[PDB]
Design a protein around this motif. Structure first.
Motif, PDB file in Angstrom:
ATOM      1  N   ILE A 153       0.885  -1.206  -0.065  1.00  0.00           N
ATOM      2  CA  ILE A 153       0.153   0.019  -0.187  1.00  0.00           C
ATOM      3  C   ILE A 153       0.761   1.321  -0.026  1.00  0.00           C
ATOM      4  CG2 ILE A 153      -1.423   1.300   1.876  1.00  0.00           C
ATOM      5  CD1 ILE A 153      -1.898  -2.361   0.722  1.00  0.00           C
ATOM      6  N   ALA A 154       1.871   1.793   0.852  1.00  0.00           N
ATOM      7  CA  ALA A 154       2.516   2.781   1.414  1.00  0.00           C
ATOM      8  C   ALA A 154       4.063   2.688   0.815  1.00  0.00           C
ATOM      9  CB  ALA A 154       2.427   3.222   2.633  1.00  0.00           C
ATOM     10  N   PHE A 159       3.116   0.535   7.415  1.00  0.00           N
ATOM     11  CA  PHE A 159       2.583  -0.480   8.417  1.00  0.00           C
ATOM     12  C   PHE A 159       0.983   0.252   8.760  1.00  0.00           C
ATOM     13  CE2 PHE A 159       2.959   2.018  12.182  1.00  0.00           C
ATOM     14  CZ  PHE A 159       4.106   3.036  11.862  1.00  0.00           C
ATOM     15  N   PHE A 160       0.216  -0.866   8.716  1.00  0.00           N
ATOM     16  CA  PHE A 160      -0.938  -0.787   9.588  1.00  0.00           C
ATOM     17  C   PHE A 160      -0.920  -0.961  10.912  1.00  0.00           C
ATOM     18  CE2 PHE A 160      -4.208  -0.473   6.149  1.00  0.00           C
ATOM     19  CZ  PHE A 160      -3.382  -0.909   5.021  1.00  0.00           C
ATOM     20  N   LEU A 161      -1.538   0.058  11.874  1.00  0.00           N
ATOM     21  CA  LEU A 161      -1.720  -0.558  13.253  1.00  0.00           C
ATOM     22  C   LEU A 161      -3.192  -1.220  13.092  1.00  0.00           C
ATOM     23  CD1 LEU A 161      -0.457   2.258  15.681  1.00  0.00           C
ATOM     24  CD2 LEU A 161       0.699   0.161  15.196  1.00  0.00           C
ATOM     25  N   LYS A 162      -3.020  -2.336  14.215  1.00  0.00           N
ATOM     26  CA  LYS A 162      -4.203  -3.361  13.970  1.00  0.00           C
ATOM     27  C   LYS A 162      -4.681  -3.798  15.385  1.00  0.00           C
ATOM     28  CE  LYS A 162      -5.950  -7.315  11.606  1.00  0.00           C
ATOM     29  NZ  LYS A 162      -6.303  -7.808  10.107  1.00  0.00           N
ATOM     30  N   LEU A 166      -3.512  -0.761  17.663  1.00  0.00           N
ATOM     31  CA  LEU A 166      -4.109   0.497  17.624  1.00  0.00           C
ATOM     32  C   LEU A 166      -4.516   1.094  19.118  1.00  0.00           C
ATOM     33  CD1 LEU A 166      -5.096   3.106  16.267  1.00  0.00           C
ATOM     34  CD2 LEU A 166      -6.756   1.782  15.377  1.00  0.00           C
ATOM     35  N   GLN A 263       6.983   6.762   8.948  1.00  0.00           N
ATOM     36  CA  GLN A 263       5.504   7.427   9.694  1.00  0.00           C
ATOM     37  C   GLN A 263       5.344   6.761  11.015  1.00  0.00           C
ATOM     38  OE1 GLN A 263       0.731   7.504   9.777  1.00  0.00           O
ATOM     39  NE2 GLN A 263       1.684   7.058   7.876  1.00  0.00           N
TER      40      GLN A 263
ATOM     41  N   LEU B 188      -8.030  -0.699  12.636  1.00  0.00           N
ATOM     42  CA  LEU B 188      -7.038  -0.749  11.557  1.00  0.00           C
ATOM     43  C   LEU B 188      -6.444   0.745  11.412  1.00  0.00           C
ATOM     44  CD1 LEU B 188      -7.321  -3.087   8.443  1.00  0.00           C
ATOM     45  CD2 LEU B 188      -5.609  -2.513  10.142  1.00  0.00           C
ATOM     46  N   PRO B 190      -4.289   2.841   8.786  1.00  0.00           N
ATOM     47  CA  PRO B 190      -3.528   2.826   7.823  1.00  0.00           C
ATOM     48  C   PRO B 190      -2.440   3.862   7.781  1.00  0.00           C
ATOM     49  CG  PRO B 190      -5.449   4.262   7.086  1.00  0.00           C
ATOM     50  CD  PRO B 190      -5.423   3.730   8.608  1.00  0.00           C
ATOM     51  N   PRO B 191      -1.407   3.549   6.801  1.00  0.00           N
ATOM     52  CA  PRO B 191      -0.363   4.526   6.384  1.00  0.00           C
ATOM     53  C   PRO B 191      -0.984   5.644   5.772  1.00  0.00           C
ATOM     54  CG  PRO B 191       0.272   2.381   5.572  1.00  0.00           C
ATOM     55  CD  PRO B 191      -1.099   2.261   5.975  1.00  0.00           C
ATOM     56  N   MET B 194      -0.072   6.305   0.229  1.00  0.00           N
ATOM     57  CA  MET B 194      -0.500   5.088  -0.876  1.00  0.00           C
ATOM     58  C   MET B 194       0.007   5.543  -2.197  1.00  0.00           C
ATOM     59  SD  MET B 194      -4.365   3.721  -1.597  1.00  0.00           S
ATOM     60  CE  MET B 194      -4.664   4.506  -0.041  1.00  0.00           C
ATOM     61  N   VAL B 198      -1.945   2.102  -6.872  1.00  0.00           N
ATOM     62  CA  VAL B 198      -3.017   1.309  -5.858  1.00  0.00           C
ATOM     63  C   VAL B 198      -4.042   2.251  -5.660  1.00  0.00           C
ATOM     64  CG1 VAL B 198      -3.230   0.381  -3.630  1.00  0.00           C
ATOM     65  CG2 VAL B 198      -1.126   0.241  -4.817  1.00  0.00           C
ATOM     66  N   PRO B 224      -7.023   3.523   1.831  1.00  0.00           N
ATOM     67  CA  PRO B 224      -6.105   2.258   2.262  1.00  0.00           C
ATOM     68  C   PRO B 224      -6.901   0.986   2.513  1.00  0.00           C
ATOM     69  CG  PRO B 224      -6.105   3.755   3.962  1.00  0.00           C
ATOM     70  CD  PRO B 224      -6.834   4.679   2.701  1.00  0.00           C
ATOM     71  N   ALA B 227      -7.434  -1.240  -0.737  1.00  0.00           N
ATOM     72  CA  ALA B 227      -6.045  -1.921  -1.268  1.00  0.00           C
ATOM     73  C   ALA B 227      -5.744  -2.865  -0.245  1.00  0.00           C
ATOM     74  CB  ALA B 227      -5.069  -0.914  -1.239  1.00  0.00           C
ATOM     75  N   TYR B 228      -5.955  -2.971   1.062  1.00  0.00           N
ATOM     76  CA  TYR B 228      -5.753  -3.930   1.930  1.00  0.00           C
ATOM     77  C   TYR B 228      -6.861  -5.141   1.682  1.00  0.00           C
ATOM     78  CZ  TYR B 228      -5.177  -6.063   6.914  1.00  0.00           C
ATOM     79  OH  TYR B 228      -4.875  -6.729   7.926  1.00  0.00           O
ATOM     80  N   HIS B 229      -6.190  -6.417   1.326  1.00  0.00           N
ATOM     81  CA  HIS B 229      -6.783  -7.633   0.651  1.00  0.00           C
ATOM     82  C   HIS B 229      -6.960  -7.547  -0.604  1.00  0.00           C
ATOM     83  CE1 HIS B 229      -8.122  -9.436   4.596  1.00  0.00           C
ATOM     84  NE2 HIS B 229      -9.086  -8.802   4.674  1.00  0.00           N
ATOM     85  N   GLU B 232      -6.364 -11.035  -2.944  1.00  0.00           N
ATOM     86  CA  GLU B 232      -6.347 -11.897  -1.856  1.00  0.00           C
ATOM     87  C   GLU B 232      -7.771 -12.794  -2.128  1.00  0.00           C
ATOM     88  OE1 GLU B 232      -4.190  -9.511   1.660  1.00  0.00           O
ATOM     89  OE2 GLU B 232      -5.703 -11.028   2.266  1.00  0.00           O
ATOM     90  N   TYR B 243     -13.997  -3.839   9.886  1.00  0.00           N
ATOM     91  CA  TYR B 243     -12.803  -2.910  10.362  1.00  0.00           C
ATOM     92  C   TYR B 243     -13.345  -1.487  10.622  1.00  0.00           C
ATOM     93  CZ  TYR B 243     -10.303  -6.499   7.589  1.00  0.00           C
ATOM     94  OH  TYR B 243      -9.913  -7.679   7.219  1.00  0.00           O
TER      95      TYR B 243
END
Lengths: 408, 408
Positions: A153-154, A159-162, A166, A263, B188, B190-191, B194, B198, B224, B227-229, B232, B243
């Motif tokens: 993605i970035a 990274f995502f926090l999850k 988070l 970031q 979640l 995201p950054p 992007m 994407v 973001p 784009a995640y998944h 997949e 989410y």
């Protein structure tokens, strides 16, 4: 920049103090004479105007005469241009001179020789019972950051926090803000944008283009919290000022891990004092005690190093780092920098001290309280168990009472 | 893009459904025939290959013959190029076709005709006792944002959050995240970067330059979280996915006020479902009930409007807005958008539904829970008193029990 007045024998100030500070920074000592020679030229023109001011106004109080009051104006505009040129050339050298290095600073050119001055906490080690994992592997096992999907993605280090990642990040941000609000601080969240013109006075940064002028993404809350109060007078009754800076941060220099990233989020202590009565030196201890009390509340072992004169950047007169214990790798890593920059930025930013004679300027300091992703990484390693990670006691309220993060 | 299969009479699907949806979007109906004509060409080449595949492999099972098995390979590489060209030209028209407009959508070209469908809450009005102030003046009086110093620093619409402004922003972010975590959602973050490549599949945005490829700043967590998944497979046992997206947001389109701004924070509901059994249409109600329950907990009066077919963007099959009451100006303003985009993004992002026959794709929805600075502005106006602003009941724990914000 430093006070031109501290280069003038004239005003009862010894320029050797500047020369000594240059030595301690392992930088040009010859430049201190260059600057004195330029200052003198400039003040002569500065005066060489008021010679042709008075002689111009002298003619007035009476073509062997009428042509005399002609040239004395051609003079006072010709010589005013020279004054401009002198000011400009004086700026070009004085710009290059670092802030005056406090005497308590260890003199040396290598951070290798940074002087440890304080230790705290009982450091954890890999026992036979449990091999201590590193933050990279504990983030994967806990399932609290998607560095892989982040990276697609970035781009790199993205990274995502999850889930509880988070919640933890947020727990630390609010723990820090309340921690500091209890010690006389006022929250401030700056814009993550800043105009290059302004950044100048406070290209290793991201450029943002679109609406208006080209702007930078901020590397630290410290940068916007420095432009704030530009060109202002601050009244002695206002000072000292305590701001708890909060923001996202964007660093260019850095698909697994959230420690070495582009970031991140960061609480900063940013403090303004008056320039007299040792106030800034007292505030540096205050801020450093605050950084200490906070890593002690988190129960993270650390050591305080004083930074060698050779490694001080141009704004810092003195600097400590709080390096905290990373038990898997048995290393201390930098989680805090605590600087007193005195009137160095203030003087460029025309941030003044009076009610509103000869110009006084405020003192400004900055001290990371926490870089959250880094602090987390340090929390993970020091709080790990066979099957998950315990949550520090003080963060438990902000995580709704949860005491443990199990591995997937 | 929409499913090419819904244009094929062949597979037992009526292309009039597409034509009707074009009508409701007040867009080309002729393009549905253009696409059928292109699809047919392409499938003939797609087949016109396997004619020269079999005739090539027919020669095999035996220069009146040896020169025959020469051209039949020159063919099957020549005709494979034609198949590429057909696919490409089919993409150019099918790209332009909007998602299929659900029948429950009001048909009209002007949002002026948006159909109010629900009201809630007892709306406050300026009494003789108290002229109700607007968010702009209440932010100045409360001292919770520096829009002026923000503007010098970050350019226009630039603001600091300050004191109880930051605490409130943070109170709303954590109230929202816990609100949603209680309803089966996983946090979640995201950054905020992007990659344009994407973004394409999910230039009214800021461009960020520096490390790696040129990237955009995100306008919404929704981008973001889409784009995640990518690429997949999601297993039926995984779906539905909930989410709670959290991020800063950067909009180009916008020195007093924090409502109409370039940078802001936002909790988003982002949900994936399977594409059968009316699942996405059930989730749209679920997410819309969640948006409702939340503004009801804040005790902010609102109305729900359904968006006319003419105003749906290309991804949305259907859309509601929760417009909340701004009592000083006696207007409702947009605080929520709730969209079901079905398989429209999923199909570009190759986000599939199977274990891992003919290809199924997931359904994806998005619904702002809160844009914090906007929600605050709405809180200020509806909770104001002669001498300050009361804090909503549910935000009081996250603000350490404080019930009131006095004017300076």
């Amino acid at each position: 920049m430093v006070d031109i007045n501290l280069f003038r024998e004239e005003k009862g100030n010894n320029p050797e103090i500047i020369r000594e500070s240059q030595r301690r920074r392992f930088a040009s000592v010859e430049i201190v004479d260059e600057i004195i020679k330029l200052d003198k030229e400039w003040r002569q023109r500065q005066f060489e105007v008021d010679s042709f001011r008075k002689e111009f106004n002298k003619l007035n109080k009476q073509s062997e005469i009428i042509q005399q009051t002609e040239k004395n104006k051609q003079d006072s505009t010709a010589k005013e241009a020279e004054v401009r040129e002198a000011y400009a050339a004086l700026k070009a050298k004085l710009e290059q001179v670092g802030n005056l290095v406090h005497d308590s600073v260890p003199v040396d050119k290598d951070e290798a020789n940074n002087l440890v001055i304080k230790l705290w906490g009982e450091k954890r080690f890999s026992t036979p019972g449990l091999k201590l994992k590193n933050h990279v592997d504990l983030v994967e096992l806990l399932g609290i950051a998607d560095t892989k999907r982040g990276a697609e993605i970035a781009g790199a280090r993205g990274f995502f926090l999850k889930g509880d990642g988070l919640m933890l990040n947020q727990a630390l941000i609010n723990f820090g803000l309340t921690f500091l609000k209890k010690r006389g601080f006022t929250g401030l969240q700056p814009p993550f944008f800043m105009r290059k013109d302004v950044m100048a006075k406070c290209e290793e940064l991201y450029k943002v283009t679109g609406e208006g002028d080209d702007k930078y993404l901020i590397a630290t809350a410290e940068q916007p919290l420095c432009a704030y109060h530009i060109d202002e007078w601050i009244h002695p009754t206002e000072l000292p000022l305590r701001y708890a800076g909060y923001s996202s941060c964007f660093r260019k220099e850095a698909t697994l891990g959230i420690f070495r990233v582009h970031q991140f989020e960061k609480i900063e202590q940013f403090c303004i004092t008056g320039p007299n009565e040792n106030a800034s030196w007292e505030m540096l201890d205050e801020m450093m005690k605050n950084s200490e009390d906070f890593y002690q509340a988190l129960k993270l072992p650390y050591q305080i190093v004083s930074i060698v004169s050779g490694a001080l950047n141009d704004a810092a007169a003195k600097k400590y780092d709080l390096e905290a214990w990373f038990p898997s790798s048995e290393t201390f890593r930098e989680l805090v920098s605590c600087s007193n920059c005195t009137d160095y930025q203030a003087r460029r930013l025309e941030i003044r001290y009076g009610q509103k004679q000869t110009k006084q300027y405020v003192h400004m300091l900055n001290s990371t309280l926490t870089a959250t992703e880094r602090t987390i990484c340090c929390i993970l390693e020091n709080y790990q168990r066979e099957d998950g990670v315990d949550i520090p006691e003080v963060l438990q309220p902000f995580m709704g009472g949860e005491t443990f993060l199990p591995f997937k």
